[PDB]
Write a protein that binds this ligand. Sequence first.
Ligand SMILES: Cc1cn([C@H]2C[C@H](O)[C@@H](COP(=O)(O)OP(=O)(O)OP(=O)(O)O)O2)c(=O)[nH]c1=O
Ligand SMILES: [Ca+2]
Ligand SMILES: [Ca+2]
Ligand SMILES: [Ca+2]
Ligand SMILES: [Ca+2]
Ligand code: NA
Ligand code: NA
Ligand code: NA
Ligand code: NA
Ligand code: NA
Ligand code: NA
Length: 898
Amino acid sequence: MKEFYLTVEQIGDSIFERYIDSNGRERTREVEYKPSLFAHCPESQATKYFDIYGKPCTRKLFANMRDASQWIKRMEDIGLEALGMDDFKLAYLSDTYNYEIKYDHTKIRVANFDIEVTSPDGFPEPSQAKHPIDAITHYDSIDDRFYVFDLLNSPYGNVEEWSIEIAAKLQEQGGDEVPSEIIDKIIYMPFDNEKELLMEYLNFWQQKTPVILTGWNVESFAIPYVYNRIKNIFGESTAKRLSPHRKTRVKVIENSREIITLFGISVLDYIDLYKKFSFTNQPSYSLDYISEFELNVGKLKYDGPISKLRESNHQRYISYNIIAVYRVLQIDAKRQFINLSLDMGYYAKIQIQSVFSPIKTWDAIIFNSLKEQNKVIPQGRSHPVQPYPGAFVKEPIPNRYKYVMSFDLTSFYPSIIRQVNISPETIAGTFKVAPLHDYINAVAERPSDVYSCSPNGMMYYKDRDGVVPTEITKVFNQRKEHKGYMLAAQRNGEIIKEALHNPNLSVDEPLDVDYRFDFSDEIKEKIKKLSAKSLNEMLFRAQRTEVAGMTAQINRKLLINSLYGALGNVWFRYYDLRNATAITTFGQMALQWIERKVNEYLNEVCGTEGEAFVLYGDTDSIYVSADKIIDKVGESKFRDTNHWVDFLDKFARERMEPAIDRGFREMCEYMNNKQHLMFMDREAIAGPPLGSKGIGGFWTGKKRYALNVWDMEGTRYAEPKLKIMGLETQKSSTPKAVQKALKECIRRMLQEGEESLQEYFKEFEKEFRQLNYISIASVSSANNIAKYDVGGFPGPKCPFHIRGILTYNRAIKGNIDAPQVVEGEKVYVLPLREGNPFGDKCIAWPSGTEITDLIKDDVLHWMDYTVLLEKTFIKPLEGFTSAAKLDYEKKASLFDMF
DNA sequence: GCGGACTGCTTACC
Ligand SMILES: Cc1cn([C@H]2C[C@H](O)[C@@H](COP(=O)(O)OP(=O)(O)OP(=O)(O)O)O2)c(=O)[nH]c1=O
Ligand SMILES: [Ca+2]
Ligand SMILES: [Ca+2]
Ligand SMILES: [Ca+2]
Ligand SMILES: [Ca+2]
Ligand code: NA
Ligand code: NA
Ligand code: NA
Ligand code: NA
Ligand code: NA
Ligand code: NA
């Protein structure tokens, strides 16, 4: 096989690389890398090298990397540009791997681990590490084994060995329900004392040194705790064995919090992977909560606090430590963020951990692309941060909207980049701008008949290829492929859902199909004959495939959109507000241009005149009212709900889309762009069920609407799905039960109507006081707690949730056992009635947890249900109904005298 | 006494 790197580091004049060789063996080498940088030279001394603007450069080879650095500093002192890749690691990877890297993940050692630390006095600070490590579970992807390190003897209690027999048993059997599929993959190692455990763990670590290191909060807890605990017990030199090059870096962030860097290892903390790539916003980030959300597994049941879990039930303590490791593996098998990281990493030729940084990622991609053409990249420059305009958002009339059909541009900003040919080296010049609306209304003169233009005043060469359009097109093409797999899996999913209404009472097996492709006619008919067991199992697999495709597509979308963003970031080598603004301004034009076009077409083709068909739009979308399209054919002429959905689908596809294409082709001609790429397709088709009292949809304002959608991008739902954006149902700050309740209110408004809504509202108001307190607690981030802490009491302008935390701190004052609220973390928040013993109107505690038993029963007693109802439920519901022209409570009439 | 304007904060949409 072809060679591929694992990790790379720069240590002085040395580059330490771990890699897989031709034969597939993991090796390590120290290369005294000789880097090259470039300086502008006279036109005479022209060679192979030119900068992106075509200026000739002399290559300077350095004896070592330190000489290259000092030369950059000297060029600064003189005042001349020092060109080339300054991050020498990237240059090394580029030199050593001058080809598209095809890697084998089975050769990459991916380590998942989690530790346990019993602490009698609050959270065990990793910087201190004054408490014994009493459990480590370490999964090795190559061995496919769970290595368990268990401490039997500790100053916090002596315990017996862990039983794998009991761990495997059901919880109903008094066991721990450790999943059977990993029982045989467990390698158990008990220890007499901590020193021998840690000594053995280090030797294990040397034999099986992680390349990718992951787990849950491993960077902020596990890694620094293990490092410091070993450093304290054995000395710093022994602690440095955690690095395969024996080099570590301790980053001090008192704010005492330390972030350790282990050279030769790529740490991909899964909580960080999750926060960046999952596109969720969770009210809690405990592994327990996340596992429940992602995998639908039950909460880990146990008695007493974790601080005493080891002494009381050491059996369950160890089993839970093993399960915690497996949970992350399971989440990754679904989400596949590690696979995504490896893909991006080797594509860009960076350190794998640099996937968290789109700027670093694109810097390397662009550098490699330019390097292949013997071109030289510019030097990074210092820039002041400046604001600049972005997208346009139409102000909608707050109202209900019965029939709605939406359209959206494909990969807007990247497409604009490719269309206009926007790139640092393709700038042709400028022109005098007319106001933006003159271009929208096709009144302003054509900017240029020679160059490609944006309404911000920028002109670009139509002939030359740009490194930014070139490299962004490559990633986009990948994105398009993976979205295709996703949508097909989604379409296949609905097919199975429909067949779940007629499940055959039979014993069979789930069909063997690649869910990434639309089911063949053969497969469809077989599905209509399978059992509920086989169908449900297929549905599960169809959704797993869809999720996998989602991860692959939405994050390539994130990457390319981040390239656009990078153009407006001062730390990006190719920062340029001319280009950034060229994109956004063009976008503002493009959206409002097509609004005018669609309005003109519809008005004509619908017979009317001057009517507003487009009711809303954000950045690159339009929401077209389709009432008069349905009315032009008459509502009675439709068989069922599905019939008119088929009609609008055909109408949007056969008539609207070609018209929209013509409008954008003209705009492309107007701007004299390089290539027409403004592709606006139909997205949603919304409306009430046929012959019902539902309103279909409504808008309360910008970025706040709800639609009863029957079809989305070609996927025809078996049951109508509510597309709700911006409303309280979509916010993590809204209490769980309230989200659920508000959504059903919305569902009833859109699908059933006013009477159904009032019916449900009356019931919810009557019974909501029985809801669990967690389900009705609000959630908020806890930032700058100390900023508003004045003697344990709320200082001036203290935020409501911060007040709740201060209330909590006073309530738990005097107990180190009580859970502390962590700065930056999220908290549950509850209002308190006026005569409460806490001395304030609200209280807040760490989210994802049951509030401490110290004050729990008192909180439950003094909860303000009246305030909770009106503030979190009624007030938002009033907003929904006012806009939609509805009442949630039956109004008083003159008939009330009867 | 409290509403409206403005501010900080939070978390959406794109
Ligand atoms: C979601 C998102 C969008 N945007 C900008 C750039 C996008 O082109 C524009 C519209 O975003 P979207 O319309 O939401 O998505 P997209 O057009 O980029 O690609 P697609 O619709 O086919 O899934 O908004 C960002 O800059 N950052 C983001 O995170
Ligand atoms: Ca011993
Ligand atoms: Ca779009
Ligand atoms: Ca689309
Ligand atoms: Ca089309
Ligand atoms: Na743990
Ligand atoms: Na069970
Ligand atoms: Na120490
Ligand atoms: Na059937
Ligand atoms: Na007419
Ligand atoms: Na979309």
